[PDB]
Amino acid sequence: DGWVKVHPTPGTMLFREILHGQLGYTEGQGVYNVVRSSEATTRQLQAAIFHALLNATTYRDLEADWLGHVAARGLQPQRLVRRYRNAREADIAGVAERVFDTWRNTLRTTLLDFAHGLVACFAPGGPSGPSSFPKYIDWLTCLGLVPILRKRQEGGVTQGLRAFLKQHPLTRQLATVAEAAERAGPGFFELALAFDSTRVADYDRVYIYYNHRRGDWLVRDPISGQRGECLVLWPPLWTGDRLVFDSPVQRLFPEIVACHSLREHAHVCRLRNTASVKVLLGRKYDIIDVSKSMDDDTYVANSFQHPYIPSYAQDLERLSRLWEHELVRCFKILCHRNNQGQETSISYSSGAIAAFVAPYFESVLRAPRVGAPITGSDVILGEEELWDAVFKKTRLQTYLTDIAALFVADVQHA
Amino acid sequence: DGWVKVHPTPGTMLFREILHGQLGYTEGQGVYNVVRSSEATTRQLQAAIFHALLNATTYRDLEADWLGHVAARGLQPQRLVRRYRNAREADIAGVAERVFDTWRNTLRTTLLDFAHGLVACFAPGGPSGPSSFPKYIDWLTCLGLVPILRKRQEGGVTQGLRAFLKQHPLTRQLATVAEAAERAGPGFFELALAFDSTRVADYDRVYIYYNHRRGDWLVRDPISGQRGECLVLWPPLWTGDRLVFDSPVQRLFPEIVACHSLREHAHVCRLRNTASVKVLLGRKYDIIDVSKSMDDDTYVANSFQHPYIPSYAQDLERLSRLWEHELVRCFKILCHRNNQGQETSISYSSGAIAAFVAPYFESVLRAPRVGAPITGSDVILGEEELWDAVFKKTRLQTYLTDIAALFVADVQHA
């Protein structure tokens, strides 16, 4: 009652073959390889993990750790003042500031190592393999639908997390690290659980059914028999005895088909003109035309020759430029420019990362909220630069600076 | 009695098929992918929510929170002066200013977290699904009409608000934030109800009737039988025989049709010239012309040959430029360029955001209020920078600065 098959039809297979370059290729299509890059998602995961780790810090625990470090070094301010026996406030303040700076550097590098360990643990799951981001992107590019199958199970990411966390020696060395780990454990476990729950269906196996009257989707895997959900980003259109998607490939399809047909005709015409001389016959390296079978009681009037050969450079150039412009504007890809002449730099714009990465996490993966998203510049930015940027901009720095200021004031005033 | 159907006619279906690119495609048409972007509406929602949250802050609650924080830290100004025992008012003023600054940073991060939570709650349902902004835009671009259907119901947005607001622990932490939230709750509920009540009809199901004698519109859904309202932004014209709309696609239609027909004729002529030699016959790889099928008391006088092949590159280029100029001048889209490079970025102008987003919220969504609209520059800005700007220019900055100045004066005069 109103159901119809959508995906296993030859049209989408032809779309995917076009995406693989099975018919024709152009320089401008190469931009698509940057669209599938998994840099933005990994950067977002790094930012989320950094925020989650640094949001568990406690001021009192940090103060206790600093006091313990000072006691271990035996560098209490009064002892140093009574050893130096001078009223040089600037010198003793500089000494205390240097000690605090060394402690800050050691804490920063320990936190960086722990955070990088967490990021490395989370890395293999998302960008490739199960629930891979390029699979989502080419799902969007071909159809506009992203079928998903869900089942509540454990996975390897959680196993790696539980193996790594329990044996980590950094917890036994710093109370702050252990407290942050134990407070953020449930969140990380839930995040990995969400990672391992979802699975984007492969292109060659899944089935999609659409009903026009009710306007609902059905997606199932014919092998396992499992039913899932069908996510739609831009909806298709029903024109009666047809279905027309609004994916970029759908828009670019007629031009590609026309250019391919032109190239085939050009090749066929080229192979015809191999011979140099051609001779015609009639009723009273070389190719002969015999018209005896058709000249029966017939008289020849005239004979014309015109060796036409089509040209297809302009069509290929236009198709390449069209592909580049369509992929740049549709996915909102930002290109950096040199001073003059050529330009070579491709990255994701802020609008692109928002409108594509955020729906991925929110709906496709159903992960919990990850906080404020990164900007478009942070994708270009490196790992350590992002780490110490978020370290500076977080509230962990304020407690450390306040402690340093109070300690320096107490040292210099006494 | 004067009613005539409008929308299910083949003309509008052909207009939509033109938008999907059935009748060819050009690089100029790709600018349409920026007109349908949902950045402006999300920016407006963020600004409205930020204003609603910031306007509800209370001076007395903030003063009480400041006193409580001072008591918790034990930072009584007189006690600190009696402890330090020095006449350096600059040092104590700097200490108080630093404490106020750290509290400012913590309050800012908590407010940002709560505001981002609300924005994430409102985001999924606004620009897509019900009241889909791209659907509104392509309704405007095809016809000039935006049919709507309304019903008073709750929805997922209200449920998400109910779950998030009452289960967020931030309310139990700061009295000021909870007080502002409980003041702003009714407005957020009304906004969510406005989101959930309005639905924009799909292009493939709804029906539209017009009657020129009275000048009235009728819109109905043939499936559910529900009757809605028909909104008009630029009115159409009635010429007796037909109804002529004034949407951009209507103006650009004849040029598109002419170019498509020219391309078809060029292809047909191209397929004819695949034969190198052509032969003619008459009464006393190869193509034979037997004109003796008609020869009866006849005599051949002369023969001619002229293999014409039309060219269509200039037409395609002109059509692309016309498409780009029409879209830019109609939707008022601002284009940015480098020193010599073209299309550094594409963004909505202030006139565009006003004249398109504001009528959307005011009529289609029937939102109660959106506050002062943002400029075109705020679209480029990210969420965090926009939040910083609105926080700087809001009412709350008055109370915070006044309290900080008064406390600094009291500390330095203690």
Residue numbers in the entry:
A (entry chain a), B (entry chain c): 24 to 27, 29 to 308, 494 to 623
Paper quotes:
Three capsid types have been recognized from the nuclei of herpesvirus-infected cells: empty A-capsids, scaffolding-containing B-capsids, and DNA-filled C-capsids. A unique portal vertex exists at a 12th I5 vertex through which the genome is translocated during assembly. Here, portal proteins assemble into a dodecameric basket-like structure that is thought to seed the assembly of scaffolding proteins, in turn driving the formation of spherical procapsids composed of MCP, SCP, and triplexes. A separate protein complex, the terminase, associates with the dodecameric portal and initiates genome packaging and the concurrent autoproteolytic cleavage of the scaffold.
